[PDB]
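Quick one before lunch.
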Amino acid sequence: RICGVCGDRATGFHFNAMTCEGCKGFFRRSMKRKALFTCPFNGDCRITKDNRRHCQACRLKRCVDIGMMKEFILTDEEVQRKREMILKR
Amino acid sequence: RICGVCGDRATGFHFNAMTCEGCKGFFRRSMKRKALFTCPFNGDCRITKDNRRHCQACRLKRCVDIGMMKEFILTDEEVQRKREM
DNA sequence: CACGGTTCACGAGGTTCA
DNA sequence: TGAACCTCGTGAACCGTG
Ligand SMILES: [Zn+2]
Ligand SMILES: [Zn+2]
Ligand SMILES: [Zn+2]
Ligand SMILES: [Zn+2]
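Model of the zinc ion complex:
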């Protein structure tokens, strides 16, 4: 269906919210990288499939608000223990 | 395509507008200095690739008249925090 | 299939130096 | 001023396990 962050074509659930592939990734990177973003405008930017790269603060706050969750992102160790298991197959 | 300010060949989007490399820089430099310009002639020079730099006031105007947003310029703070790594 | 991650080409922000 | 260059954030493709 539709991405709950930017409106774009969703591709399924990601981190617990219906989203597109861009926002799936923006959300994982942003949380892992612990980025802190700051809106250049008013803090209530209207996110769309085309302007979403313009306000990260608003995009990120939106992800969290529609329900996306960091706890679903793997930790480095979980990834490692996981690379080890695919590389043991 | 073509630069929305001078007609030069644009290099991609810049501050949210299709623009050449020079107008890109001119915009960012002006805004980072708040630089206010005045125009030596009337107040509507026709900006071209050639003259382009003879009227700062009219150019910066046209820049804004086509979308370029000073908000997309990195803040002294962000330009810094980031300037570390 | 669903949904975690990884790969890699590409856009757009800033910087250098003539 | 602006050509040329350095960076890294993006997202389309794609891999792998549950
Ligand atoms: Zn989205
Ligand atoms: Zn915003
Ligand atoms: Zn131009
Ligand atoms: Zn003028």
